[PDB]
Amino acid sequence: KPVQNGSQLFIKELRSRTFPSAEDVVARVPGSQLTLGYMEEHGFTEPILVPKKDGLGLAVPAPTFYVSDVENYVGPERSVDVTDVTKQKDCKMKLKEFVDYYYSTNRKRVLNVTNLEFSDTRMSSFVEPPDIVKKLSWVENYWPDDALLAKPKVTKYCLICVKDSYTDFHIDSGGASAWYHVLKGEKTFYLIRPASANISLYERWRSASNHSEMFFADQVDKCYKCIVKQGQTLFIPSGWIYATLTPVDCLAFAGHFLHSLSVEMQMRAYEVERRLKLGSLTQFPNFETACWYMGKHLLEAFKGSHKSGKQLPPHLVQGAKILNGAFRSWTKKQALAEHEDELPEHFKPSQLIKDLAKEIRLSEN
Template sequence: MASVPVYCLCRLPYDVTRFMIECDVCQDWFHGSCVGVEEDKATDIDLYHCPNCQVTHGPSVTGGARDASRPMKTGSPQFIRELRSRTFPSAEDVLLKPSGAQLTVEFLEERSFSVPVLVLKKDGLGMSLPPPSFTVSDVEHYIGGDREIDVIDVGRQADLKMRLGEFVEYYNSPNRERVLNVISLEFSETRLSNLVETPKIVRKLSWVENLWPEESAFERPNVQKYCLMGVKDSYTDFHIDFGGTSVWYHVLRGEKIFYLIRPTPANLALFERWSSSSNQNELFFGDQVDMCYKCSIKQGNTLFIPTGWIHAVLTPVDCLAFGGNFLHSLNIDMQLRAYEIEKRLSTADLFRFPNFETVCWYVGKHLLDTFRGLRENRRHPANYLVHGAKALNNAFRSWTRKEALPEHEDEIPETIKTQQLVKDLAKEIRLVEDIFQHNLSKTGMPFGPPRGFSTSLPHALMASSPTPGHPLGRKKVLKPKEGGSTLGVPKKRGRKGKECQDKAEAGELDLLEIHTKHTLKKLHPGNKSKGKVTVISQIPGSVNHCKCLFSSK
């Protein structure tokens, strides 16, 4: 909601340092001192009628005499009181709760990162943060008090601008006349950034971190580091984070309560209808869906919210938190769906992911290079990656249609030949699907072998091009450990083991070939071959090179 000037009867402009109250009839705002309403008495007023509206609608309604047919407004004191008193299904029913060390790319690949993840202690997350003694005054010290920031007036659910120094003064004041909340202070380009390192899993997955070229003519999106400062009773209404980004969220001091809703097709349709309704601020969206989960994030906890999840946030006590947003390849389709919802709702550019389509084009080019590199080495991309590439290519077709192009061409990188990319990516997807069908008809398994044999693409690969000469990302080299093996191939273990190693290094032996031999041996027990195949896959940073041992029984 855009910030607009509000004037009292005294004609002085709205001032965050003075208590104001809204008339429930004309919806104008008035200084409490101008209309004889003291702040500590305002919470007892259910319906306020200004001096002008009292003539036609009677006096204000207080203390339980409230008209029950008139909904309360989101963010109002009574709304907060009722929200605190309500019960919700516990998010424990859907949360994953790994340790920091357990939260790896493989962990999320196996679970498709489809439910929220709560890590109770930051140990093992590879994340750097200031100590819990860090305060909002320290935030001002590192960013600068003159920095203009966006602030939400919770009672009005409206935006306003303030200097950071003014907000810190308000935050530290014992007498706050308004409930103000800061949730969009991005600090990547400030000194505070030196104190905060995002979780390792975010750095591994993030498209912007890994695939945004340094030579890009577009401004790099800075959305990975936010400082969130909310006072008691701050409330952010239900939303999907811009561009369908996933979120990391660490509570340094205080507590936050999240209300979480799955992004099912039905819930997304309801959300879009609710977001575009004229009385949105009188409807609690959690009441419109089948399940709204409550999740309390205590001091020291870190929450990861997946793509598309609809959520609201209540601050039960003063809170200082750090968080950030990131796009990734685990659920490309849902990211695109969220982006399309934003467009249909005509979301202002200020509240959308910067250069969202641009980063998608860079990713599309990288996926093409990745698919080609894997195919040339007779390997297969993970199923979620194929599904995501199809969704991305469909979006590319939509954005480049003749009638739609004028709206989208400003975000297309000059280095991308759009029509050729769409054509080539579609071809690679077809080739993968042909192999999928071929394997399914021959072995009953589309890509992969039996349980324990993984053919998914390690996401570390997504940060580097599989073929030389492509500019996206930085080249990564896997170095052998001392006394260990190179690219997952063991050191010499007898003559047959050496033959297997030589073939693997020469690119003559791949996962599909091993699996085929293994399957044929099962299908034809009369085969005279007595070799034994042992497979260990997913060597970090490599393209699923095999570790195979042929030995006599």
């Protein structure tokens, strides 16, 4: 007799379990200290909690902004993805109907909205991602405004979760990093380090037919518990395997981004999700396109280095090597035309690869 993940009993069982504190792993940092220099010094390999939004350059509405306000600014008629936590099955419904449920007393069901991207709505102007995210983000820096392919629509999510909701262990799509801001309520994260063997266990667990009957954290050494409270912001690094529990009704904002400190992990995660073939619904759209733009940027940086007389930093050269490898796999004979759909206009992949390979050789000397 197995326990279904996200069921009433599961939650009761999970609430009772003791986990190691995120204390020893999650750094608490004031917003003004979260700079590019800080990220480079530490490598953004561990999650970071910023207890107050001051200095982050994050814009969000006041905590007097309610789910009812979300309905108004997003649009009552908007189709949204709703997860039935007690079944771990998703469905579609008008936001109006979810909001109706949310304000119901005697909720029979445990339902959440965790995929509402609002950048195309009136609510978009009320939220601006942290400055550090804009500084790190490959799309923000390298995807041109006049591009014929649409930017990955992953920059502004509104998360609405009722008390006792649960999101099972996962790695976010594209191995993207995340910022996560709790506006009202609190959100508990269960964090697992993306050590290589953990990643492999994760892939095997997730590919198993009975994954919903198995608590993944049982298979790893350390799963850290991190409570994120009202007004706090959590930055989750590339590749981290995590689940969440919602202790009280919670409203949160989040966004996802790729960056130059985790090229290797981004590719490893992308490779895993492609073998899993999930149709994630939360997929990082045009991950490959963002990588092509990064690759073009790196080539320009290499060429520029000859005029500046200053070498690119080692992690960028290593990043270039990893990207060039991916570029080769995506354009191989058998490498499909699913891959060609993600190539930006005006790209000559075989020429880019050859030019990057040469610049890398020159740089290494």
